[PDB]
């Protein structure tokens, strides 16, 4: 079994945000909108229920650890279920976690150059680690071929760089370079069975659609139902195409992307606060249930026994 | 009136801590304990009822304003009722709530230049966050006087600089300066009524003790039951007194001086996941209640209304 659990499912901000008023967050605050609250974009992954994988660490970290009884083991009076942790990209919403981890070190952290580099400079995470016991011990994702974390020896990870979005503290933001952003394969070496997993997705192209029809489901990007949300919600100017995030909707939307991926399964994840998809009554929550699209939720876990083929 | 709204009481780690499995950790997981979980130290203070000033940022920030309404006063699509922040030391449980307010900056951070210096350089949150709409703007806390946020124009705030315990990652923890800590008194000049907070508390003295018999409250340390309690719960081999911190028994500690100010209400706070007055049950926390001290919990609404001379 490849055990996925998703520890949060919300863009940055989460939901609801806490500086917001919009349809949706003042909906659920005032009791009117049938929704469920979720922290920031995180999932842990194992092949065995014990030695898990953190992919991404959410601010919200401590939330999600406590929600997630594997997190604590408790087989000694320190101890912790997460054996490794896996970074996508360097956003403060994939990263400020690690803070919370201070306590736990040393960790094995996987991430590319490119964000090794934001994460000892602009928000220089690995310096400041440092202090606390040894801090985080960087492993290199090379941008290609694959690896493997010893505490989960079946898994096979192998990364995808995409369109690179660096964040907007980072010394290279307006010099984007591969290996900002990655989307990640992870096979199940005992079965074949993949997971595609690319919480933030602003481009695709037919090197990665190709890829992409080898996995068992798909675990994309949700961020927003049109291009334009942000400025429909009045809650800003930010366009999907201005954040890398493609849209829900519309041509080129990853709606229609999916489509060409009748056999997997497919789940939304990293969905912002203003997406009408978080709300359960919806005709857009309707209308990915039609498309055979599930809406990731916190909590929610997915197995995966076998591959397709 | 000067509202207190206790948003986390726990020391750094909260309570129960991630990776910790401690009698108390332990017990509260177990359900054999009677306590309740904490968020990591703030406070939020209000003349009004309306602008509130922000004591510290924790990293449990987005579950702390969640938890108390007037934080989102709901009136526009983006507000807060979060009008100022002052950070009383540069500890990573003191300052990385910051990071989580990112999508509503400009905000107007009070701090001294020896934090200022901490926050652009080991941990750069100033330089990190001016990419996010001009980010966080500083407004230095002077070592000697008083201020006033204009928001909450009642307030008047007085820094007393504590003995200096800089973070770990601090480019002078080795080598520590008047500034990196303070504790602060607070009155309401309408009424006289003072608050003196200090989570962080390492020495007293005479200057320091006679200041504290103007307060009417007195909101301080209540880290550790024992200078040696984390080695005593086997979590660890630390001391209070090489973290800064007065523990509340033995002699020199903070019920002994707590001793000497009967007509104050006195309120522990910052009290780590190990120490046993977060079991209601403990012969601790009967004696800190024979004493005529409270202990914080997450909620805790303290209402100063006039001084007692
Ligand atoms: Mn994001
Ligand atoms: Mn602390
Ligand atoms: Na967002
Ligand atoms: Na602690
Ligand atoms: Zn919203
Ligand atoms: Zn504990």
Same mark, same amino acid.
């Given at each position: 079994?490849?055990?996925?659990?998703?520890?949060?499912?919300?863009?940055?901000?989460? $939901?609801?945000?806490?500086? +917001?008023? @919009?349809?949706? +967050? %003042?909906?659920?605050? &005032?009791?009117?909108? %049938?929704?469920?609250?979720?922290?920031?974009?995180?999932?842990?992954?194992?092949?065995?229920?014990?030695?898990?994988?953190? +992919?991404?660490?959410?601010?919200?970290?401590?939330?999600?650890?406590?929600?997630?009884?594997?997190?604590?083991?408790?087989?000694?009076?320190?101890?912790?279920?997460?054996?490794?942790?896996? #970074?996508?990209?360097?956003?403060?919403?994939?990263?400020?976690?690690?803070?919370?981890?201070? /306590?736990?070190?040393?960790?094995?952290?996987? +991430?590319?150059?490119?964000?090794?580099? &934001?994460?000892?400079?602009?928000?220089?995470?690995?310096?400041?680690?440092?202090?606390?016991?040894?801090?985080?011990?960087?492993?290199?994702?090379?941008?290609?071929?694959?690896?493997?974390?010893?505490?989960?020896?079946?898994? %096979?990870?192998?990364?995808?760089?995409?369109?690179?979005?660096?964040?907007?503290?980072?010394?290279?933001? $307006? &010099?984007?370079?591969?290996?900002?952003? #990655?989307?990640?394969?992870?096979? &199940?070496?005992?079965?074949?069975?993949?997971?595609?997993?690319?919480?933030?997705?602003?481009?695709?192209?037919?090197?990665?659609?190709?890829?992409?029809?080898?996995?068992? @489901?798909?675990?994309?990007?949700?961020?927003?139902? /049109?291009?334009?949300?942000?400025?429909?919600?009045?809650?800003?100017?930010?366009?999907?195409?201005?954040?890398?995030?493609?849209?829900?909707?519309?041509?080129?939307?990853?709606?229609?992307?999916?489509?060409?991926?009748?056999?997997?399964? %497919?789940?939304?994840?990293?969905?912002?606060?203003?997406?009408?998809?978080?709300?359960?009554?919806?005709?857009?929550?309707?209308?990915?249930?039609?498309?055979?699209? /599930?809406?990731?939720?916190?909590?929610?876990?997915?197995?995966?026994?076998?591959?397709?083929?």
């Amino acid at each position: 079994m490849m055990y996925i659990q998703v520890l949060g499912s919300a863009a940055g901000g989460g $939901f609801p945000q806490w500086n +917001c008023n @919009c349809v949706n +967050c %003042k909906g659920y605050r &005032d009791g009117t909108l %049938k929704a469920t609250a979720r922290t920031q974009s995180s999932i842990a992954l194992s092949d065995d229920g014990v030695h898990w994988i953190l +992919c991404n660490a959410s601010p919200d970290i401590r939330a999600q650890l406590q929600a997630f009884a594997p997190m604590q083991p408790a087989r000694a009076l320190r101890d912790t279920g997460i054996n490794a942790i896996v #970074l996508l990209d360097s956003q403060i919403d994939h990263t400020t976690g690690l803070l919370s981890l201070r /306590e736990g070190c040393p960790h094995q952290v996987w +991430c590319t150059d490119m964000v090794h580099q &934001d994460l000892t400079t602009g928000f220089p995470l690995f310096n400041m680690l440092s202090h606390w016991n040894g801090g985080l011990q960087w492993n290199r994702i090379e941008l290609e071929g694959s690896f493997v974390i010893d505490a989960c020896p079946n898994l %096979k990870f192998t990364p995808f760089p995409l369109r690179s979005a660096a964040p907007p503290y980072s010394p290279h933001r $307006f &010099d984007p370079h591969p290996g900002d952003n #990655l989307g990640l394969m992870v096979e &199940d070496t005992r079965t074949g069975g993949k997971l595609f997993y690319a919480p933030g997705l602003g481009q695709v192209d037919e090197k990665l659609l190709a890829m992409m029809h080898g996995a068992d @489901c798909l675990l994309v990007d949700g961020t927003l139902w /049109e291009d334009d949300e942000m400025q429909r919600r009045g809650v800003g100017t930010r366009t999907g195409r201005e954040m890398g995030h493609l849209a829900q909707n519309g041509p080129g939307g990853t709606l229609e992307v999916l489509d060409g991926f009748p056999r997997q399964r %497919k789940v939304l994840i990293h969905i912002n606060n203003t997406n009408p998809i978080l709300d359960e009554n919806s005709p857009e929550r309707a209308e990915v249930l039609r498309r055979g699209v /599930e809406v990731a939720f916190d909590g929610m876990s997915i197995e995966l026994l076998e591959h397709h083929h």
